[PDB]
Amino acid sequence: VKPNYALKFTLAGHTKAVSSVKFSPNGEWLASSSADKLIKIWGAYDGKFEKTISGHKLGISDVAWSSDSNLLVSASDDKTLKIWDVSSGKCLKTLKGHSNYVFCCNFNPQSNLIVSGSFDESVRIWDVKTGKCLKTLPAHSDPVSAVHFNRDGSLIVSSSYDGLCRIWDTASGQCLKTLIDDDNPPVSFVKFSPNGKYILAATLDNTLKLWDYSKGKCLKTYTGHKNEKYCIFANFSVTGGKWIVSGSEDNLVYIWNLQTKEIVQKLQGHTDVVISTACHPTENIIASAALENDKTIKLWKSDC
C-alpha cells in the first residue's frame, strides 16, 4: 500500500523564504510564516489567499494554532512571540522575555498555555490570557529547535543542537526524561505522536528516529532524505495510511511507511529546500513550503 499525493495548488505571495506552515485544527485554514516578517492565511482546500497578518519587526520561524482555530502564535527573531486574533488580524499580546531569537512555539491542547523555544537555550511557558511568562526552563546548552505538547498537555518535549531530547512535566517544569544517542548529533526537530506514546526526532545527519522515551529505545529509523543544515519539520500522517512525512534539502518531500521504514513517495516540484511540511487533520492533504529560491507553498492530495 502506497499513497499517491499529487500537486493541486501552488501558493505564492511571500517575498522571502517560507519558514513554517500549519493547518488549523478545524481543517479550514493553512497558516504560513516567513522570513518576510509576515503570516499569511490561505484556504486549506482551494488554496485561496485569505489575508496577511503583520507586526513583527523581524522574520518569523514558526507559527501555531489554538485548539479552537481562533488564535495564532508566532515566534520571531525580534525576540518576542505574538498572539494574534485570526479573524481580525490584530495582535492580542506580545510575549517578551527571551533574550535571543524565538525559534519554535506551540499551544497546549487546552490552549491556555504556550510553549516556546529559543536560541537563548531556554524553554518558556506562557499564559495565553495574560501574556505573562509562567516558567523559564534552563532546558538546553544550545539553541532549542523544537517544542511540542503531548495530547493532554501534561508533557512538553524539546530538542536542541546540544544533541538532547528532553521530556518535561508541564505543571512543575521538572525534567522527566533525557534522551542521549551515541555521538550526540544536533537534534533539529521533535514532536509527540498523536497517541502521545512515541516521539519523532530529526537529527542533522540525514536521519529521523521514532523513540519510546519512557524506555529510552529507538524503535524506527527513516533515511534517504537530506537533512544536515536546516531545522525541517516532520509529521505523522494518520488520516489514511500511517506515514512519516518530512521535507528535505534536496527540494523533495519524503513519505515513509511508519512500520516498515521504506520510502513510499517522493514529491517533486519545489525549487529550494523544503523547510516545512504539515498534514491535514482529516483529509489526506499535505502542505509543503520552501526557502529563498522558491518562496512558495504547495498543497498535495492523496487517495490514501
Binding site: 522571502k16 523564504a17 517560507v18 519558514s19 513554517s20 516567513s34 522570513a35 522574520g59 520561524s61 514558526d62 527573531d77 531569537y101 525559534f103 536546516y230 531545522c231 523547510i275 526557502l291 529563498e292
Partner: peptide
C-alpha cells in the same frame, strides 16, 4: 531565522 530558520530559513538560514
Amino acid at each position: 531565522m530558520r530559513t538560514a
